[PDB]
Amino acid sequence: TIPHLAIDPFSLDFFDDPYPDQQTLRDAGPVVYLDKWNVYGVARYAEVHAVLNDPTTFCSSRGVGLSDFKKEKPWRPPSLILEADPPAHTRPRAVLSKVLSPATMKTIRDGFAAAADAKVDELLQRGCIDAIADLAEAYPLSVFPDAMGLKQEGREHLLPYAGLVFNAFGPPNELRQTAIERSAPHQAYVNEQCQRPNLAPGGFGACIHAFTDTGEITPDEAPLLVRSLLSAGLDTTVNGIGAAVYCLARFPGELQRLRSDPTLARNAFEEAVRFESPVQTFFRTTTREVELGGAVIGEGEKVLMFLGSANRDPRRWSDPDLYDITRKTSGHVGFGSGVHMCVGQLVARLEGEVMLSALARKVAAIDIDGPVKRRFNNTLRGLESLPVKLTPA
Ligand code: HEM
Ligand SMILES: O=C(O)c1ccc2ccccc2c1
Numbered sequence: 181t182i183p184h185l186a187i188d189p190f191s192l193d194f195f196d197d198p199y200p201d202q203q204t205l206r207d208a209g210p211v212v213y214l215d216k217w218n219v220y221g222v223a224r225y226a227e228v229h230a231v232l233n234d235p236t237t238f239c240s241s242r243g244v245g246l247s248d249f250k251k252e253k254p255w256r257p258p259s260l261i262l263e264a265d266p267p268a269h270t271r272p273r274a275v276l277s278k279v280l281s282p283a284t285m286k287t288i289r290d291g292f293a294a295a296a297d298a299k300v301d302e303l304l305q306r307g308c309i310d311a312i313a314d315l316a317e318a319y320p321l322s323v324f325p326d327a328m329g330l331k332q333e334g335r336e337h338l339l340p341y342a343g344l345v346f347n348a349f350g351p352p353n354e355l356r357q358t359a360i361e362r363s364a365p366h367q368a369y370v371n372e373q374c375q376r377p378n379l380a381p382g383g384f385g386a387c388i389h390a391f392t393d394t395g396e397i398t399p400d401e402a403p404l405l406v407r408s409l410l411s412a413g414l415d416t417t418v419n420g421i422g423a424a425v426y427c428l429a430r431f432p433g434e435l436q437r438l439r440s441d442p443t444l445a446r447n448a449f450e451e452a453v454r455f456e457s458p459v460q461t462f463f464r465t466t467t468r469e470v471e472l473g474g475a476v477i478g479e480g481e482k483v484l485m486f487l488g489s490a491n492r493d494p495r496r497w498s499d500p501d502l503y504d505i506t507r508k509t510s511g512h513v514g515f516g517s518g519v520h521m522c523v524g525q526l527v528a529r530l531e532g533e534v535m536l537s538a539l540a541r542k543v544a545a546i547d548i549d550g551p552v553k554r555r556f557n558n559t560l561r562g563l564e565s566l567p568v569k570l571t572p573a
């Protein structure tokens with residue numbers, strides 16, 4: 181009576197065509213057993229939300245990828261923020277929270293909006309640009325590392341580093357294994373930029389470091405908390421911004437609606453996060469016997485959370501399959517929900533806003549003239565190439 185399923189939600193065929201299979205996983209019960217990996221999973225908005233909002237029953241401190249840390253050697257020592265539970269999680273959540281506050285945002289928005297306008301300009305003069313490498317990658321890349329206060333050298337490694345991390349959450353398939361064995365130079369690069377002297381003052385890196393001086397964090401914890409933003413900080417957004425553009429490309433009218441009202445910018449990004457959901461999936465582990473979606477699940481059980489699914493659940497969302505920029509997007513789980521809810525959402529939104537804001541004032545049409553190509557990854561959903569023509573306003 182927990183229906184089994186052959187669906188492998190970490191398979192290349194699944195990533196290419198997720199959406200029919202997701203539907204199955206919601207209409208198969210509110211709780212399902214994937215025979216493939218021996219793990220329970222919940223796909224509906226209903227359950228997903230509940231799970232995220234009960235950290236006590238569904239802890240994160242035993243891994244939020246497949247591998248239970250209670251039993252297995254992590255591939256690296258875990259997050260202080262992501263793979264920790266209240267009480268422990270509160271301190272580093274705090275320190276990160278301050279660092280990335282709407283205060284901190286105000287002091288940097290202008291820079292971000294400026295570069296956002298110049299990049300849409302730069303591209304418009306080409307015409308045929310690749311919406312990923314020339315925009316979704318390029319724009320985040322230009323701004324975010326600088327905003328961290330990183331060196332120039334080495335930024336090659338950022339996306340491959342974050343991809344590794346995001347791959348390591350999945351099951352021990354090909355994507356994952358490969359990613360690990362190619363990993364060393366990426367890490368060695370990141371571990372280097374987390375150290376105090378390599379972070380220019382002003383940047384999130386140094387702002388984070390100051391917390392060592394007050395006692396707020398230790399100096400061992402200091403670099404670990406930076407690593408944290410260099411894992412979760414870029415790929416996600418690259419992928420979000422890319423996702424957005426993909427939308428306005430497939431929904432011409434909805435673009436006209438944005439051009440017409442460019443103050444809907446921020447919200448157009450958000451609905452895009454709902455609509456594609458960059459971070460697709462994430463595990464928890466039970467800490468007691470818990471009754472979930474009608475079923476009783478024993479403790480120390482892994483539960484997979486289908487975050488994308490939740491965001492497209494017909495049961496919670498009117499017309500889940502449509503990119504509608506005016507939606508009440510509040511409630512979507514694209515940045516998670518509850519205590520771990522993306523501590524960086526603001527930066528992401530700042531980015532997505534100004535970018536889409538610029539696109540709005542400056543561009544007239546977006547057409548996909550090319551072969552569109554998909555970057556596969558156990559946890560991240562996004563594109564590798566998206567060839568577009570860009571009509572100038
Ligand atoms: C638009 C792209 C982004 C998406 C879709 C996204 C998604 C998420 C999600 C779903 C979670 C919850 C994890 C969980 O519940 O276990 C989360 C947490 C987190 N995010 Fe993001 N994020 C994005 C951008 C960012 C940025 C720009 C930063 C850095 C400033 C960031 C840093 C973090 C960190 C450090 C956590 C752990 C939070 C905690 O445990 O309290 N993310 N993010
Ligand atoms: O997301 C990426 O851009 C990316 C690129 C190369 C990657 C190589 C190995 C593992 C993950 C990777 C992710």
Ligand SMILES: O=C(O)c1ccc2ccccc2c1
Pocket residue numbers: 258259260261262345404407408409411412
């Ligand atoms: O603290 C980290 O290293 C870390 C790593 C990967 C992460 C992935 C998504 C969100 C937060 C993350 C934090």
Ligand SMILES: [Cl-]
Pocket residue numbers: 256367
């Ligand atoms: Cl690492």
